[PDB]
Each structure stands twice: as structure tokens, then as C-alpha cells.
Amino acid sequence: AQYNANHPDFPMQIEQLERYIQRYLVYAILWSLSGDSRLKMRAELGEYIRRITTVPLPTAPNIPIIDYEVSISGEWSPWQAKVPQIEVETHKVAAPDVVVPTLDTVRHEALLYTWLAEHKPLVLCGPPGSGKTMTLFSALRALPDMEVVGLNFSSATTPELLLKTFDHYCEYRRTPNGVVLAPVQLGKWLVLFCDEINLPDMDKYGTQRVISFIRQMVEHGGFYRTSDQTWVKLERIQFVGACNPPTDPGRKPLSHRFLRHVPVVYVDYPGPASLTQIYGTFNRAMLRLIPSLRTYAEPLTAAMVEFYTMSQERFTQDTQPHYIYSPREMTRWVRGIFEALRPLETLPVEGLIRIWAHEALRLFQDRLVEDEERRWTDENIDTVALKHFPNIDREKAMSRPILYSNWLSKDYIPVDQEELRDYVKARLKVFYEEE
Amino acid sequence: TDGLFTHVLRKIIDSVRGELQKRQWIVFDGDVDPEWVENLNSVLDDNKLLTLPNGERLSLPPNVRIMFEVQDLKYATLATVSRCGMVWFSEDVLSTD
Amino acid sequence: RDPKEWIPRPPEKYALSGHRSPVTRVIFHPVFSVMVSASEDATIKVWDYETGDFERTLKGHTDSVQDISFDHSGKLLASCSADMTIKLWDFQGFECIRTMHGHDHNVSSVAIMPNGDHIVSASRDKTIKMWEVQTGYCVKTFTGHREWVRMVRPNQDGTLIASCSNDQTVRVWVVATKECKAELREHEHVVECISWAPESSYSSISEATGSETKKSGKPGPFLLSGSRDKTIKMWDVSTGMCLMTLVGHDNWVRGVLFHSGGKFILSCADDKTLRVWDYKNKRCMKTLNAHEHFVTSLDFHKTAPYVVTGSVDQTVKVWECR
Amino acid sequence: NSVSAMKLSPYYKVFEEDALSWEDKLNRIMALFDVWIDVQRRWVYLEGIFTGSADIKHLLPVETQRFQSISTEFLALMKKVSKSPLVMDVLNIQGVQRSLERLADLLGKIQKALGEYLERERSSFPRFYFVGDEDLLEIIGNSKNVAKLQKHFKKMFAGVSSIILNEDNSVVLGISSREGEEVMFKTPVSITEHPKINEWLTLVEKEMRVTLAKLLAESVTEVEIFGKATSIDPNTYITWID
Numbered sequence A: 001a002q003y004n005a006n007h008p009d010f011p012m013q014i015e016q017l018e019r020y021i022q023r024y025l026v027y028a029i030l031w032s033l034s035g036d037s038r039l040k041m042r043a044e045l046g047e048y049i050r051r052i053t054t055v056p057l058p059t060a061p062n063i064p065i066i067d068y069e070v071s072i073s074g075e076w077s078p079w080q081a082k083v084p085q086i087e088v089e090t091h092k093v094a095a096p097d098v099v100v101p102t103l104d105t106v107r108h109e110a111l112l113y114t115w116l117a118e119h120k121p122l123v124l125c126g127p128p129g130s131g132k133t134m135t136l137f138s139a140l141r142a143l144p145d146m147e148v149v150g151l152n153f154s155s156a157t158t159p160e161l162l163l164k165t166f167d168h169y170c171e172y173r174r175t176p177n178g179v180v181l182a183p184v185q186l187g188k189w190l191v192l193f194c195d196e197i198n199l200p201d202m203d204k205y206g207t208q209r210v211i212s213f214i215r216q217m218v219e220h221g222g223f224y225r226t227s228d229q230t231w232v233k234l235e236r237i238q239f240v241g242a243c244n245p246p247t248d249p250g251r252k253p254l255s256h257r258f259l260r261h262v263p264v265v266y267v268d269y270p271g272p273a274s275l276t277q278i279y280g281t282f283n284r285a286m287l288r289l290i291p292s293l294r295t296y297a298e299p300l301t302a303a304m305v306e307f308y309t310m311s312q313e314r315f316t317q318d319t320q321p322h323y324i325y326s327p328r329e330m331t332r333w334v335r336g337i338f339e340a341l342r343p344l345e346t347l348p349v350e351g352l353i354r355i356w357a358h359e360a361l362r363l364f365q366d367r368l369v370e371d372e373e374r375r376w377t378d379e380n381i382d383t384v385a386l387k388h389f390p391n392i393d394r395e396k397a398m399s400r401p402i403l404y405s406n407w408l409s410k411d412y413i414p415v416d417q418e419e420l421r422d423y424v425k426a427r428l429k430v431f432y433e434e435e
Numbered sequence B: 001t002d003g004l005f006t007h008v009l010r011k012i013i014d015s016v017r018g019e020l021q022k023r024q025w026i027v028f029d030g031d032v033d034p035e036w037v038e039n040l041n042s043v044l045d046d047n048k049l050l051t052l053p054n055g056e057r058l059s060l061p062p063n064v065r066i067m068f069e070v071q072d073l074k075y076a077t078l079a080t081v082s083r084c085g086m087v088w089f090s091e092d093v094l095s096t097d
Numbered sequence C: 001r002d003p004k005e006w007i008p009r010p011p012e013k014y015a016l017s018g019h020r021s022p023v024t025r026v027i028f029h030p031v032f033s034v035m036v037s038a039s040e041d042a043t044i045k046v047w048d049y050e051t052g053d054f055e056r057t058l059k060g061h062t063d064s065v066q067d068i069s070f071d072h073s074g075k076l077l078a079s080c081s082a083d084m085t086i087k088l089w090d091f092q093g094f095e096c097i098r099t100m101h102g103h104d105h106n107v108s109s110v111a112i113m114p115n116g117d118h119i120v121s122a123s124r125d126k127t128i129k130m131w132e133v134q135t136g137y138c139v140k141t142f143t144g145h146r147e148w149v150r151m152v153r154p155n156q157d158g159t160l161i162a163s164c165s166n167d168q169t170v171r172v173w174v175v176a177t178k179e180c181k182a183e184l185r186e187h188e189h190v191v192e193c194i195s196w197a198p199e200s201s202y203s204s205i206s207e208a209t210g211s212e213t214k215k216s217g218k219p220g221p222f223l224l225s226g227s228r229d230k231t232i233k234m235w236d237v238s239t240g241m242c243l244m245t246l247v248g249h250d251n252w253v254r255g256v257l258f259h260s261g262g263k264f265i266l267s268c269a270d271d272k273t274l275r276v277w278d279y280k281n282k283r284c285m286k287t288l289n290a291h292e293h294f295v296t297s298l299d300f301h302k303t304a305p306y307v308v309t310g311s312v313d314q315t316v317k318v319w320e321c322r
Numbered sequence D: 001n002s003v004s005a006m007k008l009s010p011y012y013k014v015f016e017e018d019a020l021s022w023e024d025k026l027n028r029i030m031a032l033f034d035v036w037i038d039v040q041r042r043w044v045y046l047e048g049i050f051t052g053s054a055d056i057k058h059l060l061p062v063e064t065q066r067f068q069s070i071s072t073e074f075l076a077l078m079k080k081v082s083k084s085p086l087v088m089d090v091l092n093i094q095g096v097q098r099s100l101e102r103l104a105d106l107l108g109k110i111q112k113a114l115g116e117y118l119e120r121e122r123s124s125f126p127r128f129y130f131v132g133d134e135d136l137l138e139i140i141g142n143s144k145n146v147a148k149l150q151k152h153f154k155k156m157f158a159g160v161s162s163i164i165l166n167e168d169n170s171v172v173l174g175i176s177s178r179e180g181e182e183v184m185f186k187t188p189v190s191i192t193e194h195p196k197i198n199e200w201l202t203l204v205e206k207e208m209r210v211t212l213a214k215l216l217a218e219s220v221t222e223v224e225i226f227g228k229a230t231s232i233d234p235n236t237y238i239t240w241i242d
């Protein structure tokens, strides 16, 4: 219909319509029957479709069908055409708003925009830090008529949180057909983003009260106002959920009655190639601050990715609950290096490597419990830096007391231990008399 | 900050809503003593000005009449009595019938 | 030695060291060629800045002395200490003629009004009080600061007093009517020191900031406020706007003041350095490694080419200017 | 009045609902426009203050920024009005009454913050000391439209009730009194050459003084004939008086 509106002189023809509908039907089956599974399952489903369908399909020998979208003209077009190698502004490096385009990113954005346009509740499932909130917000940027309100569920979450959110952001107005709950602002659809939908505790009879409450509001279009036992109908209110996989500790599987109303998309961790692309773009944007260091973007990104991968593999939730590593730590790495490089007019390669190692220590070693894990982190930081940055001063870059502070200077520069100790002693002398 | 009489007179003078084209009568229904009525000495004289301490002077429009409705003048001075035309309403004017 | 252009030079003249505790503040005698320094050992030592010879110690305070000041004639010295007391010293006889109580906690600043008949002080109880010199009676209590008031300084004519506090704001009060003329809040950390702009620098400030000449003829009082965010900000008291921000200290700024000629800004910080700022170009000209530890205060002699800086290393230094 | 007269009529029972609706809408349009006229007047004589003065930005920065924002909002509302200039359309604007109330409050807040500016402008033209703050703001802000300044000349001059202007309203040709008596300036004062209110007002008063002096000289020359004369005819005396 939108294409017909865009072309009043040449409406859609029947042959183009049937081609488009067939291709989109195959695409929709693929993204509906495997959107909540890994990439391998999606490839298997695509292979089965290719083996059993009669619809024209992409000719690529190895590229799976799910990598191809359906253009409005009615032909398969690869998703790779919508992922350009952008150049991020230096002042927007690793910012929360900026999203580096990626095949998975664009596919998930299109899928969410498809589901969000119908005001259909949806759930994004995946490991923490994979990009569920990022993808949802990026998709919502394409829908100017929607306001997102973030709610964070926990083990003690009850429908009272939803009621407070409704009181803050919506109003109960009396209508001849009954009481209707709608957002205070007009013409906009309120989107309720629930970040931890599967944490709320199940009672001894296997029921989550807030999940049943959401199911009631979704299927029946409203709920009951317990103050006066009056049915309240929802208007212009939408639900979006995010959650870790149900197999994770502290997570409970969702009710099958609730799941039928919500399609589920699986947002997995970006692969080494995707991580390399994203953070190479970030480093290229970052390293333009110092022109002499521009040639070190690729080895720096490779070292970052390698160390992150080994840290993720070595430390898991089996040992400690807080041993969770994600692209969020990589983003914090890039942000830390960028903030350390902003005031510096120039810096040798050894200084950049020292900043890299300092940020690696601050992100991957602070949360470690045992001393052996910290020793492992130190040794592997040294080995990674040697491997990806050969022919550099080892001692100048990895003097073990890696300390950085802006207490002894206007900028964030390395600080000697003895000078810092003396300064902290004097500051403590002032601290005693002041605080 | 304008007082009640000052605000009324200024609103009449400004004539934002056509006050000057009407017949404006200001009636002072109450007691008269030199503390407040002597401030109207310039208003009730031929000057026709309401001089305020801030240096502002408000001219009396020709369509505005200053009215006093009093029961006695045992405290008004001669300056106040001199500046106005008196109409005497004896109690015999209003019979019980 | 241009009569209004000299700046201090890294060869120090003398390094006087007699204090047993960190030196709090150092000032110059307006008339005599004598220098007075206050320290945390409850002593106020008096030095001669030409020959670098110690003269005498003014004791009587129980706790650390936090601020000292002279009147216009130099015949009286007002000192405040951590024992909640302000003492008036007869500098001719070097005796304490009056001790003033009334502050509820540590008193961190004191100053004598330009008329010389009143004393203004700021303390930790978030109040600024005014005292008569003759009677020692408290007559005013400037309240409104939400935290420890660190400094108080009157302007040239004495009609305005400025104060800085731990509440990260600088307030300018009116002495006559006690009202707060302006509340200068742009520093991101605690404000340490303030200083007024002398009349000789009004034209220089106006031309450096690009401020158009007012039809009144008075550019308006200008104020400086060194703070712990390692920045110095010049303010316009009349409008309440920050004219410029001076960046370049590596630590908390402890003192700030103008050159008597009104062409440069002299400031000391805890980065162990004394810096000379060219506010015409909003840049720092010269940096002096003044002391081996934190620098607490500095003073600039009105006529003679001499700069004195106190420090926590218990040493008071005199700098020749060339 | 017509609605009330219908109300007192016995046949009003059948027409109660729509008559009440019209009463409500008339009351609401009156309530809206009563504050609208005042808000328009205040914006009119504040925009002149904040645009025709170059040093008000330096004297009152914060108030200047506040008024610039308020004027931007007022111009947005005025453009919305001009898009649909129907009285019912602007009446039915979402929150038009509330916007008018907040505009009136903000303009009043700005107006009370222009005290010292007025007390300083009084130094330019000395006769401004006998003019109220609201009247002074109206005079200074509305200097361009000299048609409405005719009501303020009686508060500054002994007998100059109004001034005489050309068709273009750009040159002062003379002054007038309350009785219609007029004095024609020998050298008319041009507002275009002296755009600021105070300079051309000072030129007007100086021209009035010199014009009265010259006319006194001419009248003395004309009347010396009547002196030292045994007999004086009526008609020449009457025309000299006129």
C-alpha cells in the first residue's frame, strides 16, 4: 500500500505483486520459524525451504537465504547492500547512541520494525550485552510516533511496578464504553520495555504474577483496576520484552500461554568478524586524534578482540556469577582509550599500548576473585601485546605498576607510585582536618 | 504599587476597553478625615491631578466625577469642604411613607 | 624592570624557614618594608623581605592561624585562627589588643575593611560576620552559604564583599544592606581563593574580554575565583557572567591575584608551581617551581618588585622580579 | 445581552441547551481575548525595548535571553493563529488560554525587571522623571508608532497636549494644546534623522522654545504699532489676537 501511495501514476501490478508476496512469504517463514534460534538452525531451515519450495530463490551457492531480504520490486536483494563502511565522527566514538551497521544489526532492525509496526508485543532473547536494547532503540528511532519507557524487572517484580508506570505516563479517563487507559500525550504509542521479563520469581505452583498480568493485558486488551474492581482497557500501549536465555541461572521459562502472543528473536553475541568490523571502525574514528598512530588501528583492534575472546572463554558463570563478559566491556575499552587520548596532542606507540593494557586491567581484572586469575590476566595481556605489537619497548610499555590518574596533572596520564603515595598522604592530611 | 483609587483612575485614564467614553463615577462611601481626603486636594481643585510620591501625576478625565457619600463632616478640614460642592440630604428628605 | 611589568623569576632571593608547621598565608606590610607570615603552629612570624632576617614572633593563638591581614595604614594586624577567635594586633607594640569570639567553628578567613573601622571574617559555620575595630562587637552576620566559607575579601571601596565556600559557589554581598548581590556558580569543585580586580586593570580586562565600553563609564567590578578543579575563572560581578576560564594548573588552586600593574595574573596551586597568566591571550606565560610541596598562598607587593609564596614545606620564599 | 433577554423570555425552555452553549462560548472568547489584548500590548512595547536598545543585551543578559525565548514562542503562536485566523479555530487551539496566561505571567516578570533600565533612560530626557514606569515603557518601546504617543505629552509638558506631524509621521511640524491651539515650528524636527526617542524629543522642546521666542519677537513688532496710538481700530486688534 505504501508503494502504491508512492507511485500514484503506476500502482502495483499483479505479476510484481505475486513475486513480492511469494518472496516475502518465504522470508517471513524463515524469520518466524527460526528467529529464536542460532545461526546454524536458521541455515538448516533455509536449506529445507530451498529443498521443498517452488518460489524463486537466491542463486548464491553458499550464502543462506536469510541473508537476503525482499525488495519491493519483488526480487531477492542481499542484506549486505545496507551495511556500508561508515566513518564515525571522532567525538561520537563508542557513544551509547551510535550503532555501527552490521548484517545481524540490520536484519534485526528490519524484523523489529516489522513487528513493532503492528503494535505486536515482542521479546528479544540473548546473552547479556549482545545488543538487544541497542537494536530495539535503533528500530524505535525509525518510528517517530512511539515513546519508549524502560522498566527493569527483578526477582521481586510485581504488577505494582507496571501500575506505577501507568500512573506516571498514562491517565485513566472515563468513557461510555468503560474506563480506558491511554498515554497522557496524544498521537503517540507508549512502548513498555521490560529488560528482565524472566527474572520475576515463580511461586511454588509455577506462576509469575507479572507475566500473567502482562498476558492478560495483551490477550484481553486490558486489566482490572483493583481499587474499584473496574475493567480498564488499554489504548496506545505496547509491550517489548528483553531477557537472557531461560537456561541461565536465575531465569525461569516463560509460560506457553504468554509466548503465543509474543514472537521471540534471538540476538546472539557478535562473531569475531562482526566484533572486528565494529571496533575497527571505532578505533579508526578514535585514532584520528593522533595522526602518527593511525597505522596501528588494525593491530589494536585485533589485540582487543583476541584478549576479549580469551577472557570470555576462560572466565564463565560456572566459576563466579559476575564473570560475564560482553561487547559492553569492549565498548568501555574503546571509550576509556578515547578519553585517555583526547587531551594528548601526541603520543608514541608505547603510550598507546600502555593505555590499552591499563584499560584491559581495569575491565577484566577488577572483578576477578582469586589471585591466579589476575596473574593469568597480566601474563596474557603481556603476550597479546607482544604478539600483535612486535618491535616495541616491552619495559617502557608494561612496567607492572600500571597506574593512571589525573590527580597530579590536568590530564589522564600515567603516574608514578611514589609520587602518588606522597600526594595521597598530603591529601589524607587535609582529609583528616576537613572530613 | 497602585492602590485601589489609583488603580481605578489609571484604568479609566488608559481606556484600554473604552473607559473614557463612559460616565465614570467614583463614590467614596465612608467616613472622611484629613488623613486620606487631603491627598485629593489637587484632584478636587482646578489642578485635576493625582500626584503620587513616585513623581507620577494622573490628570482627571472630564468624564470622571469624584463623589463622597458621608453622614457627617465633623472631622473634615476647611480645605476639604472648600474644594467640593455640597448637597445636603436632611432626614426629612426620606419620610417613613 | 618596567614599573608595571615585572614578573617573578626562578632564581629565588631568600628561603626563610622558621615555622614548625605548614605556612598558611603570607602578606606584605603596606607601609614598612616588612613581611608577615602565618602558619599552623599558632605563630605569626614577622620577616624583613630585603635582608631576609627574622624579626619576631606574634604568639597568643591557641590553634593554627588561618588568615592574616593589614589595614590601609598598616598600624593594625587582624588574624583569625582555628580556635574560633579573631585577634587584633597593635603592630607598633606587637601586642594583642583585642580577642573576638562568636564564631561557632573554625575561622578560615579575615579581612579589614578599607575604611579600617570594621573587620570581616568567614568561618566553617557557614556565616560571615562583621566586627567593629574599636569595640570588637559583632554587628552583622551574612548568612546564605550552605557550606564552609573559605575566603572573604572586600572590594576597593568596601561596599561589596565576595566569599567562596565548599558549596562550590562564589557569593558577592552588599555590606550596607546585607543582601547577596550575585551567586557565581560555575566551578565544578570546591572554591579555594578569590581576588578582586584593581581599578588599574579595568581597561585591560574590558579590552581582553572584548567587552564593549559601557555608557556609564564603569566596566563593573571583576572577580577571580581559584578552585580545586584546577581552573581560574574571571567574573563580572555586575552581570554575573564568567569572562574567561584559565586552565593549566595541575592541582587545586590555592591563591590568585593580579599584578599591581593590572597586566598579569599571579596564582599558586598545589601542583608545587607558581604561574603567571596573560589574561590578554588567556594563556600562561611563565611557570615557577616555587616549592618542594604544596603552595598555600602568595602575595604581590604593591610597589616593590617582590613576590612571596608560603608553602606546606614550612618555608617562606621571596622572589625577585625582573 | 441578547442571550440574557432570551433567557428571561418564556419560550427559552425549548432552546435552553444551545443558548447555554452559546453563552459558554461567548464567555470563553471574552476570557481569552481580555488577556490576549493585554499580552499583545505588552509584547508590542517590550519588543521595541529589547530590539531598539543595543546595550540592553550587556546590561540585562539573562532577561534578554528570556525575552528572546518568550518572543519566539509568541511568534510561533502568532503564526499558528495566522494559519487559521478564524476566531473559533484559535479559540479551539489546544491550551490557548493556558498559553496566554503563561505569556502574561512571563511578560509581567520581564516588565518588572526593566526598572533600572528605565531609571537610567530618564537621565537622557529629563522630563521622563514625571512619567510612570508602564508609561515610560510604552513611550520608549513604541517610539516607531508615534500615533499612540499623543496621550503622554500632557504628562511631560505644561501645555503640549499633542504634537503635529506630517502624513508620513516622520517629521514633527509643531505642537498642540488641549484647546486645539497649535504652534508651528519654524524648523520642523525630523524623526528619521534622529531615530532615538530622547534626541528628537529634545530637538522638539528646543524648537518649541526658539519658536515661541521668534513668535514673541514678531508679535512685539506687530503690537508696537498699537502702542503710542491715540485710536486703535477693532479689526486689526482682533486679527492680531487670533
Ligand SMILES: Nc1ncnc2c1ncn2[C@@H]1O[C@H](COP(=O)(O)OP(=O)(O)O)[C@@H](O)[C@H]1O
Binding pocket: A098, A099, A100, A101, A102, A105, A127, A128, A129, A130, A131, A132, A133, A134, A135, A242, A270, A278, A327, A328, A331
Ligand atoms: N554493531 C554495533 N555497533 C556499535 N556497538 C555495538 C554493536 N554491537 C554491539 N555493540 C555494543 O554492545 C553493547 C550492547 O549492550 P546492550 O544492548 O545494553 O545489551 P542488553 O540489551 O543485553 O542489555 C553496546 O554497549 C554496544 O556498544
